Amino acid sequence: GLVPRGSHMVEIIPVSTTLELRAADESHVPALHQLVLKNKAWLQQSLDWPTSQEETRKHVQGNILLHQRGYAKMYLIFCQNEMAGVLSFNAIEPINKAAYIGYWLDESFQGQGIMSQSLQALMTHYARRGDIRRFVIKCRVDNQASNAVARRNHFTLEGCMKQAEYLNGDYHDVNMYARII
Amino acid sequence: GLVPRGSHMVEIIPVSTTLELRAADESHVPALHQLVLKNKAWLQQSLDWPTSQEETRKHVQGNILLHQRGYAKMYLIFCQNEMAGVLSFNAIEPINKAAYIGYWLDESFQGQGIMSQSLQALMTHYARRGDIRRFVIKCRVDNQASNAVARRNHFTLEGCMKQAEYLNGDYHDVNMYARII
Numbered sequence A, B: 001g002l003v004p005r006g007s008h009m010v011e012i013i014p015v016s017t018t019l020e021l022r023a024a025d026e027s028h029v030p031a032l033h034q035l036v037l038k039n040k041a042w043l044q045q046s047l048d049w050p051t052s053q054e055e056t057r058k059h060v061q062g063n064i065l066l067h068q069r070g071y072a073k074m075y076l077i078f079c080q081n082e083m084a085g086v087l088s089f090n091a092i093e094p095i096n097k098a099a100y101i102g103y104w105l106d107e108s109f110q111g112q113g114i115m116s117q118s119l120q121a122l123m124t125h126y127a128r129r130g131d132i133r134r135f136v137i138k139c140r141v142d143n144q145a146s147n148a149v150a151r152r153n154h155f156t157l158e159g160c161m162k163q164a165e166y167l168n169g170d171y172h173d174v175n176m177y178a179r180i181i
């Protein structure tokens, strides 16, 4: 069910008249790399993004493999045809019909409700298919924006994982939210 | 630092004068298979063990690969030279220095404190090395014996994962305990 977006035949999940998710493709690496440079300062404070463009290319290629194999998913949020952020399943547990969600949005597109609409469209898409029923978000207790997205979208705080993630020199507590659909 | 146990050169973690952990080796498949047949009735009610001996061989071979690559660990508990149960790291997150522990003990060896001593020896071993610091146990809310082992060993209940695991037709709530060492 691919669909044309330039010479490129993409997998898309509709979101609204102006928003849609497109599966990351190699063609997205240059623009995605630039988006990452622009927001690098705060992305580095989060678990949502691991230097050069070749490094980005590597990351994208690895995720495309996982995406195609159903081990995870990597979608790019496009707003009116312009790349605005990333939304993914960091991991999928097919037997448990469970998935962990990761996400981030370029600073310029923030505050328009884009992430919630994108998130909602992603979960509805996989939940209708009956493929995923348990959606999980794990984020630093101290990442205000990531926690807000979870709280805006019917996720229940299941517990706080003590010093669960190593980032920039320290171990950080991380909240675990879930929603069953 | 292998050590002779029959023609076999095994990796062992000492536990007491009568107990020791030996890394699963293919030579353990026949006896391990028999241990699994004996306890199959209740093992099937738990997340600690996925029919034939070839199936067991497959499972053991896959885990030995993971064990050798540091992605997980699979140790057999030996009590006075006789196979008594299994103790493992279902997964290891090297950057986070975190590991998820799985375990089960043959019915005949239960009630002697063997699992707690084995568990303690495993965590001390990896924690001294500074390799793992966060140990996690995930088990069904309704698995009395697995929960008791966690409560006997300084693990803190971090939260309950709603319908997290698919087993025998249903989704089951599962407790998540952790201990930092």
Ligand SMILES: [Cl-]
Binding pocket: A045, A046, A047, A048, A138, A139, A140, A143, A146
């Ligand atoms: Cl985070």
Ligand SMILES: [Cl-]
Binding pocket: B045, B046, B047, B048, B138, B139, B140, B143, B146
């Ligand atoms: Cl269990």
